[PDB]
Design an enzyme around this catalytic site. Structure first.
Site, short mmCIF file in Angstrom:
data_model
loop_
_atom_site.label_atom_id
_atom_site.label_comp_id
_atom_site.label_asym_id
_atom_site.label_seq_id
_atom_site.Cartn_x
_atom_site.Cartn_y
_atom_site.Cartn_z
N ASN A 184 0.76 -1.17 0.03
CA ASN A 184 0.06 0.04 -0.04
C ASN A 184 0.64 1.31 -0.03
OD1 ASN A 184 -2.24 -1.70 2.34
ND2 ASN A 184 -2.39 -1.73 0.33
N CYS A 194 6.37 7.27 9.15
CA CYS A 194 7.53 7.99 8.58
C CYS A 194 6.75 7.83 7.27
CB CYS A 194 8.74 7.27 8.77
SG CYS A 194 9.95 8.16 7.47
N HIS A 230 3.03 2.34 2.05
CA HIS A 230 3.48 2.74 3.49
C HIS A 230 4.83 2.04 3.99
CE1 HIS A 230 -0.37 4.57 4.63
NE2 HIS A 230 -0.78 3.90 3.52
#
Ligand SMILES: CC(C)c1cc2ncccc2[nH]1
Ligand SMILES: CC(C)c1cc2ncccc2[nH]1
EC number: 3.1.2.14
Lengths: 264, 265
Positions: free
Chosen positions: B186, B223, B188
């Site tokens: 995804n 992050c 991330h």
């Protein structure tokens, strides 16, 4: 995994993991390159390796990759089983070659192929050298003696000369540094990390709209654990790119390569 | 891998790979954490997930890790087979927990254990929330209803409060940035990347002379793909203990805090 019936090649099956896939839910090219390394190591173990021979150990010699060339037709999806067959061949005194064929385990269809050239180096002085008679004898015991090529075709992409990218580059990613996960068991930067660094300077819009079909990478110098790398890319065109990795400080070349991408 | 006979836990075997091991030819703690994620994902798929439930997809909710705690007694060697058993439990409206037990497949001996706390978040607003009745009902179908803890003990390390590291740090690694291999499907940053970044500020002399026995990491903020991180460590201690802090390089926003315990080889 296991050696094949004739004992001249090795096959292993892998189930693609959740963390090994990218945005299309298929294995990244770095996952493919790690599986190629893994099946190569299992093959060396199966035929009696340390990845050095007895003579290499006596003479403080090691193999280093000079070139890696990978062509993928279909990336395996998360949960899919991919079967990879690998074998080695001596190339006289120049070096050795390791080849691979990737297949979908359910259909038996070839989904990718790869080839790599390796050169001998003294591990203490880092000086390259030709392969000795004793080393070639050790390889003859587990390599096919008639040629067997993953890329047989005359004048195919795997043997093309790669030029040096001229400044200014069209795209760049600066200040890349390895972390401990990028190192191998001997504390050297893993060969697959350099593929990741090359790809970092491809724009995200190309990655989102295209699939990587071919990558050719020449390896010239090692990135040390405390070195910093810049990744440079320029479009030369399907979309084709020319790549250069160099040390951030002095600009010393560590790799050069090309990639070919197909629009989804 | 497969669900166990009662259908309330899942087991999977893994052969440790050449590129998964460190200097001692044993799996790194990042390799262990990736195998824990993989067996967790295979468990979710086996019980009908798509890693959200039907109600979660309807309301645009997701789970995010709040804490990961891992204790390793023996790291598996290159070529060894490790068996990992995992299961989940509801913790009322607070969140959910996923636990794991690692065993040597040949000896059957427990070589490690782990526990993780997860909290519900709205995927769009990023706002945390309590677990609804419908979601708790969906979890009851595949979780043991009596408590089953990887860390049962009373004052065990997995529930300890972690303080915030005070500047100046004793050690640091500055300017850490994720590359595409650090991202999940995804886009991330993978939870395991934060463990690697925490460990980057441990001196190489400690890694060369000690083995990591316990790691506790709190996750506070994500992050982003274009963010830059600083990893800070200070010794707090035959055993060595450290306090850790990851923060964004620019503004100093905290993203994680944690502790590690190391034993001399
Ligand atoms: C980074 C590794 C693979 C490497 C180092 C090197 N040195 C000379 C020639 C080829 C070489 N390849
Ligand atoms: C694991 C990362 C993505 C994470 C973000 C976050 N936000 C709030 C609380 C816990 C959280 N954990």
């Amino acid at each position: 995994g296991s050696l094949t019936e004739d004992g001249l090649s090795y096959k292993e099956k892998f189930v693609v993991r959740s963390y090994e896939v990218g945005s299309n839910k298929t294995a990244t090219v770095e996952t493919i390159a790690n599986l190629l390394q893994e099946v190569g190591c299992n093959h060396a173990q199966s035929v009696g390796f340390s990845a050095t021979t007895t003579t290499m150990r006596k003479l403080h010699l090691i193999w280093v990759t000079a070139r890696m060339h990978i062509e993928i037709y279909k990336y395996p999806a998360w949960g899919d089983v991919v079967e990879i067959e690998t074998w080695c061949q001596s190339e006289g005194r120049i070096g050795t070659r390791r080849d691979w064929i990737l297949k979908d385990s359910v259909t038996g269809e070839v989904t990718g192929r790869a080839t790599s050239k390796w050169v001998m180096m003294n591990q203490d002085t880092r000086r390259l050298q030709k392969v000795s008679d004793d080393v070639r004898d050790e390889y003859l015991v587990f390599c096919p003696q008639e040629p067997r090529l993953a890329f047989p075709e005359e004048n195919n992409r795997s043997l093309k000369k790669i030029p040096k990218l001229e400044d200014p580059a069209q795209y760049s990613m600066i200040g890349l540094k390895p972390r401990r996960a990028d190192l191998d068991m001997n504390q050297h930067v893993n060969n697959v990390t350099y593929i990741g660094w090359v790809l970092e300077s491809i724009p995200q819009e190309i990655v989102d709209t295209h699939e990587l079909q071919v990558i050719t990478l020449d390896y010239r110098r090692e990135c040390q654990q405390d070195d910093v790398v810049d990744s440079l890319t320029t479009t030369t065109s399907d979309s084709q790119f020319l790549h250069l990795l160099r040390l951030s400080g002095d600009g010393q070349e560590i790799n050069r390569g090309t990639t070919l991408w197909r629009k989804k």
